[model samples]
Target: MMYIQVLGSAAGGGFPQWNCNCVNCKGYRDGTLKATARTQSSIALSDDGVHWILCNASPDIRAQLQAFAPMQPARALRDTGINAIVLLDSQIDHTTGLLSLREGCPHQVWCTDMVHQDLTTGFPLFNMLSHWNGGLQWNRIELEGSFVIDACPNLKFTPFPLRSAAPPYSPHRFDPHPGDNLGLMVEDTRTGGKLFYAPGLGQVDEKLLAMMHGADCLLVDGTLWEDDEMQRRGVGTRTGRMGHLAQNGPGGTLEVLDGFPRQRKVLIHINNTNPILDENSPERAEVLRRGVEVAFDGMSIELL
Candidate 1:
């Protein structure tokens, strides 16, 4: 059996967006939009439900942990008995929250070489946090390779390549750096369940689209609605145009997902400007009508 759960679904500023007094945020504050409070972006779950693994710890990871505590209740009998974390990238939204994990949990770390290098090479925050009482156990990895975790040796993970360079939302962004992006293709050895997930995909290529063709499920980038989504709203300049792929254009997500044979396809890491956030909005209904589920915090799915 395989279980996949979303911990948070918002982009950089999160749902209701920070710094913007937009109608959505205002509506959310006024209970008008039925808006959602999303963390930067993250997912958590396990083969069963007892042992839980976190994917990309978002800024609101603490809140996410609290909100989803029921999934790992100490009293639960069907727990997979997990307490590990696998970070798919080195972005702040994905790794800055590791501070919350320093308390004393025996959490094993799973990350790629690029992520490991960025964290330990010069990132002082990560190095400092490593001083915490129970430092993390690092498990270095290569894409497309599987690594087994504690107790559940049958549970392993194989990562796929994702394109990202430099922080897409950074204010003083530098040129795209080498080895800065990552995507994941997860597998369940015990149940033959597979999941393809990438919160910050820069581009959706023919190879990726082909690989994901007819997958069991896909949790992909939903960062923006258009290349200049925020720009059109006067929020910022073009959204890292060449770095993170634009969601709307000639070769956009909707267009690219046309031939995907997945049983389910959901969009996550959504920006506040996305019209789909407005549950009643036509865009929301359109995507759903086409079988694409817009992911929300706490959204859960079990593989058939």
Candidate 2:
């Protein structure tokens, strides 16, 4: 009964960004495109169907939860299927939904020490959440170490450090640490099923490659099609400087992923400007040709 569902697939600002008039955005708004609208990236996992863990808390989590029937409460009054959340980074798009989880119950928060410090001291989200709810139960995850979820004994998560910087709002914004961002290796001990997730990748390092060794599936970053995607499309910020590896280029995700052995490869956390969002675009065709899947909201997978 183990299952994983994509709650949201778009990166920051989401598809059809409010202010951007990008071709992809326009296509979605005008109903000319067949792509489903997505929110910021997030996912939910369940082992027994009654209890679930959120991979990341996206800004659109309320609606994301509402759209998924499994997350709905089975009893009357205040109740929720989500028991904990494992945060991969301290980004606003990934952590903003914690504010909406204040249903007067404590949520078990799992993340690295650096991310924990950033949220507690830099952004003060931990304190803010404490003031609103019954306070969050905190759990620290170390780099290259494994931890078993007490609520779900069959599931284990190992955090591997990625070459990524901290969010802009972090107190140690100038000081980048390996623990600032992580790629999670989620394994089901009983069934021997494994899933690797890294929605925000700065670059793929040797250690990250090792983490993907025998994964049953991989959900990776696909923020931009090229290094200068934003600039080429009239935006200011560059993809490299923004801490995301482009999907196509000399050392892009597509080429990098080619080195790995066969597995269910999915490109996730897509940017609004990425041409892969358009089903008819050549970029999308190229991605499909490489045997990679372009993630969309509401997609579900069952792991044996």
Candidate 3:
């Protein structure tokens, strides 16, 4: 069986960002809006029940693991079901959780060469962790082919590039590269249970269109509702400048997703200001009406 669970769904700072008083954040805090609080984005994938692959490490990972029963270190005193980690990008929210996993055991880290470069030079999470757990074991992933991990024997991953810039700290910050960000096509070897996951999807091209059209499930980015949401709120930059394709307006992800036919269509990596976070809001209903499911923490799925 191919089992996939969403460990966290919110983007960068998670829902209700620490320093943000956006309407959505304030509403959630004051109990006016009914919404679930989510951790930073990540997922747990497993071909078999015994071994699992954590897609990305979120800063809220420690609590996320505790919330899920199997993720708990129950087999031994210092054991984790997580056999490896495959990073889609070197984004801070995606990689900071590596610090919380200092279990004194090495973990297989799989990512594109670009991601490795960013992590090694700019942020240096791998270098910083050298003191404990013997540091991370890196398995370089090239953009052209598919790779399989020993832990997930029955699952395979094909990585395709997404048009996005590198992390701010990286030398290639504004300069986009082929492997800066990736959209994965995960398949179960037994039966092709294709899942196309791209949490930081910036723009979808013909290649991405084909991937989405051929997918069994589409788990994608839901960062901002409008292209200029942050600008309108006087908070941050526009969605395009931030390398995120917003949910609303012409040529948006929601419009594209509505046209695609798929078994599952979920939106992940949502930002705090995205009105879709509010359950009672029209924006949430609009996405639901368009057949797109808004990802919440603790959501689990079994495919193939």
Candidate 4:
């Protein structure tokens, strides 16, 4: 069976950040809200349950895997179902989990050439990983081209460049490359079901609309509720400056998602400050009324 599991749905710091005392975060801590605590953004895809390909390696990956039964050790000693990792970007949140994965098991890591360069030279994660037991085997996945994983033949993915900026820590931080941030179109060849995943976005363009056409499911960025959410909340950074298209406003992701009625649309990589995190809020109701889902940890879907 073709399976897709949402390992974590929250953004960088996750729901209840250590320092912040947001209403949503407080609710989770005080036992008033019924929200499911989530880790950083990540997902796992598998042609069969035995072997899996991780979409992004969140810092919370170790705990995320421990909570999911399928990802746990099976028979052999030190055996993990994960066979490869497909990096969407070189952000610290997405790549820090590599430190925990350095348990000396061989695994392929696929990314665009620019991301590869940033991780190796800029961040030097590749060099650090080399000291581990199972070293990383880097593979470059080109933009706008489709490729099937060697580890899982039935699973295919096409990488599409997003309008988002590169991570602040990258070497080319000022000059945002086209391939720096990307979304993936994942397909299960056997079932003909496709998922378009873009966890971060700057804006919605015609190209993104065309790529999302005819998709069975969509898990796009839902970082902020308003364009000035961060600034208004005293978070210092502007939402647009971070390369995320807010969920509210005249030309937000919600309006853009309305065009894709045929697809199962869900908001992922949500920020702790986003109003939609509160299940009782009108923002969440509006999302549900519009037929969009607010993704949570442990959400699973089967292609067939």
The CA lDDT of each predicted structure is 0.72, 0.85, 0.87, 0.85
Q: Write the per-residue lDDT of candidate 1 for residues 225-273, one digit (tens) a residue.
A: 7788777767767574645565566777777766774558889988887
Q: Write the per-residue lDDT of candidate 3 for residues 20-42, one digit (tens) a residue.
A: 88888888899888988989899
Instruction: Report the C-alpha lDDT of model 4 over 1-304, residue by residue, as the tens digit.
Output: 6788999999889988778777778878999976778799999999988778999999999999998887875777777878889999999999989888888445689998889988988788888888776578898898867988877899889888886477777779888787788899888888888888899888777878988895789889988888888777676576554888888878899989888898889999999888898888899999999999998999997765
Provide the TM-score for each candidate, comma-separated.
0.88, 0.95, 0.96, 0.95
Off by over 4 Å in 1: 70-72, 75-82, 168-178, 240-242
For residue 158, give model 2's deviation from the true position in Å. 0.6
Instruction: State the weakest 10-residue window (summed lDDT) of model 2.
Output: 232-241
Candidate 3 weakest lDDT stretch, 10 residues: 233-242
Off by over 4 Å in 4: none
Per-residue accuracy of model 2 over 1-304 as CA lDDT, tens digit each: 5678999999999987889877788888889886678898998887776778998899999999999887877786777778789998898898999988887448899998899998888777788888765677788887866998777777888888776578888888898887888888888888889899888887777767776877888889988998888988776566565878898877788998897657789999999999999999999999989999999999998777
Sorting all predicted structures by lDDT, with the top scorer first, yields 3, 4, 2, 1
How many backbone clashes does every candidate have?
Answer: 7, 0, 0, 1
Sequence-dependent TM-score of model 4: 0.95
